[PDB]
Design a protein. Structure first.
Lengths: 76, 76, 76, 75, 75, 75
């Protein structure tokens, strides 16, 4: 007769990904030969940042966040 | 007769991922040869940051967080 | 008779990805030969940033985040 | 009637003289050696050799090979 | 009637004289050597050799090879 | 009637004299050597050799090869 059949059957197989920062790099034998600083006085004051012959790897990742809002609704 | 059949069967196989920071890197034999600082006096005052021949790996990750809001609703 | 059949069956297999920053690089034996700074006096004041013979890798990633909003609705 | 005389003769020599043979070194003189090294940096393999007087012989070859095949077929 | 005389004779010589043979060194003189090195940097393989007097012989070859094939077929 | 006399004679010589043979060195003199090196940088392979007096002999070749084929076919 008036048979009603409903199949609410969605499928979800997605991917949300974020790759932020320093990923998969290769640093092979870095470094300088000779660094020489000769003086008579070093006078650093009031927010001095000094680097002599150093190797730095810095990474700031304030972002890279994911979000996923998904709703479903079957009204009758 | 007027029979009703409802199959509310959503399937969810998703992935929410975040890879933030420093992942998978390769550092092979870093470092400088010779670093020499010769003076008569070193005078550092009031927020002096000094690096001489050092190797730093720094990482800040204030983000990289995931969020997933999913609602379902069947009304008859 | 008046048989009603409905099949609400979408499929999702998408991908949302973000690769931000420094990925997959190759640095092979970087570094200068000789760096020499000979002076009478070094006087740094009031927000001085000095680099002598250093190797820096810096990475800021304030963004790179994903967002995914998806709704479904079967009204009858 | 058939008659066969298969009599080869062989007196060959296969000689190899490889290297330092028969030399004469009458009072050789090594000098004075000094090696002062400081503040060095090596990032890979190193092979060092220091000395005053030296005799080296290296013979990776000098090998003999001899083949010989005889064959007498009848009918 | 058939008569065959297969009688080869061989007195060959295959000689190899490779290297430093029969030399004379009468009072050779090595000098004084000094090596001062500072603040060096090597990022790969190093092969150093310091000396005063030196005799090197290297013979990667000098090998003999001899082949010989006899064959006597009948009918 | 048939008569065959296969009688080759061989007295050959295949000689090789490669290298430094029969030399005379009467009182050779190496000088004084100094090497001062500072603040160097090498980023790849290095091969150094310092000396005062030197004799090198390198013989990568000098090998003999001898082939010989005999054959006596009948009918």
């Amino acid at each position: 007769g008036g048979s009603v059949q409903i199949v609410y059957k969605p499928v979800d197989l997605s991917k949300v990904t974020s790759k932020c920062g320093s990923l998969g790099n290769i640093h092979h034998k870095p470094g300088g030969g000779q660094v020489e600083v000769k003086s008579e006085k070093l006078d650093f004051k009031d927010r001095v940042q000094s680097k002599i012959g150093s190797l730095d790897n810095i990474t700031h990742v304030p972002g890279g966040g994911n979000k996923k809002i998904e709703t479903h609704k079957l009204t009758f």
